[PDB]
Curated annotation (Swiss-Prot):
Binding site for Fe cation: H126, E128, H187
Region (Beta(2)beta(3) 'finger-like' loop): 54-64
Effect of C96A: Little change in enzyme activity
Effect recorded for R184H: In ECYT3; decreased interaction with HIF1A and EPAS1 and decreased enzyme activity
EC number(s) recorded for this UniProt protein: 1.14.11.29
Subunit structure: Monomer. Interacts with ING4; the interaction inhibits the hydroxylation of HIF alpha proteins. Interacts with PTGES3 (via PXLE motif); thereby recruiting EGLN1 to the HSP90 pathway to facilitate HIF alpha proteins hydroxylation. Interacts with LIMD1. Found in a complex composed of LIMD1, VHL, EGLN1/PHD2, ELOB and CUL2. Interacts with EPAS1. Interacts with CBFA2T3. Interacts with HIF1A.
Domain notes: The beta(2)beta(3) 'finger-like' loop domain is important for substrate (HIFs' CODD/NODD) selectivity.
Domain Fe2OG dioxygenase: from-to ranges: 104-205
Name the UniProt record assigns to this protein: Egl nine homolog 1
Catalytic activity from the UniProt record: L-prolyl-[hypoxia-inducible factor alpha subunit] + 2-oxoglutarate + O2 = trans-4-hydroxy-L-prolyl-[hypoxia-inducible factor alpha subunit] + succinate + CO2
Residues of the full protein shown: 188 to 409 of 426
Post-translational modification: S-nitrosylation inhibits the enzyme activity up to 60% under aerobic conditions. Chelation of Fe(2+) has no effect on the S-nitrosylation. It is uncertain whether nitrosylation occurs on Cys-136 or Cys-139.
Organism (species): Homo sapiens
Cofactor note: Binds 1 Fe(2+) ion per subunit.
Length: 221
């Protein structure tokens, strides 16, 4: 699907109405698998961190660690297809710009590739950007073929503001997710009992980012 039809007939209206938008079959099976292969290779060759320290015991051997991450620019050897994904995300956002709320997106982060190792760890309820650091949209791409949450857990649960209801997102292969990064969307990752991969990019609003700079402010003289 042209990034444009997707953006204009689905992503823009869905984001403006619900603040959450799920796109299935974003890149297709061949490309999705290549990205999966690239991410698994990063994992298998030790490029991820050891995982978030979840519980720290007096005996460090007993320490429990959770989500593992690596930061990817998309230009690294063996990361080209991740780079293609990132360029594809950028295309969608470009076609959305000026239509996602009143935001004007002018930049993004590198990609954060996350691996929940499947040891029953998840990610606590949180807001992405509670203090105004510039991020207005979170974009997540999932890689997990034939994921079944009834057996593997790992659901992303969002708690949209004002509503008495969940939004439960399975981390399905070739699924792309957008949601507002601010306090409108507190969310959590439920315990994952199988290896679970995702790739996240955050997009910046030009005005919020420009004034965030005042919080972390250098020329000599
Ligand atoms: O993976 C998911 O479906 C949802 N993930 C998150 O909400 C999430 N958020 C943050 Cl801020 C971090 C931050 C660091 C590492 C992993 C994270 C994560 O998985
Ligand atoms: Mn998050």
């Amino acid at each position: 699907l042209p990034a444009l039809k997707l953006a204009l007939e689905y992503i823009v209206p869905c984001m403006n109405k619900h603040g959450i938008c799920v796109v299935d079959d974003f890149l297709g099976k061949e490309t999705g698998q290549q990205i999966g292969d690239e991410v698994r290779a990063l994992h298998d060759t030790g490029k991820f961190t050891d995982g978030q320290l979840v519980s720290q015991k007096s005996d460090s051997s007993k320490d429990i660690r959770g989500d593992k991450i690596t930061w990817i620019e998309g230009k690294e050897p063996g990361c080209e297809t991740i780079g293609l994904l990132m360029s594809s995300m950028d295309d969608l956002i470009r076609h959305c710009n000026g239509k996602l709320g009143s935001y004007k997106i002018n930049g993004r982060t590198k990609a954060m590739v996350a691996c929940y190792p499947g040891n029953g760890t998840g990610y606590v309820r949180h807001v992405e950007n509670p203090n105004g650091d510039g991020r207005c949209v979170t974009c997540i791409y999932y890689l997990n073929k034939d994921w079944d949450a009834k057996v593997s857990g790992g659901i992303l649960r969002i708690f949209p503001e004002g509503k008495a209801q969940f939004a439960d997102i399975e981390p399905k292969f070739d699924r792309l997710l957008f949601f507002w990064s601010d306090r409108r969307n507190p969310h959590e990752v439920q315990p994952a009992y199988a290896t679970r991969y995702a790739i996240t990019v955050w997009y910046f609003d030009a005005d919020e980012r420009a004034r965030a700079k005042v919080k972390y402010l250098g020329e000599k003289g």
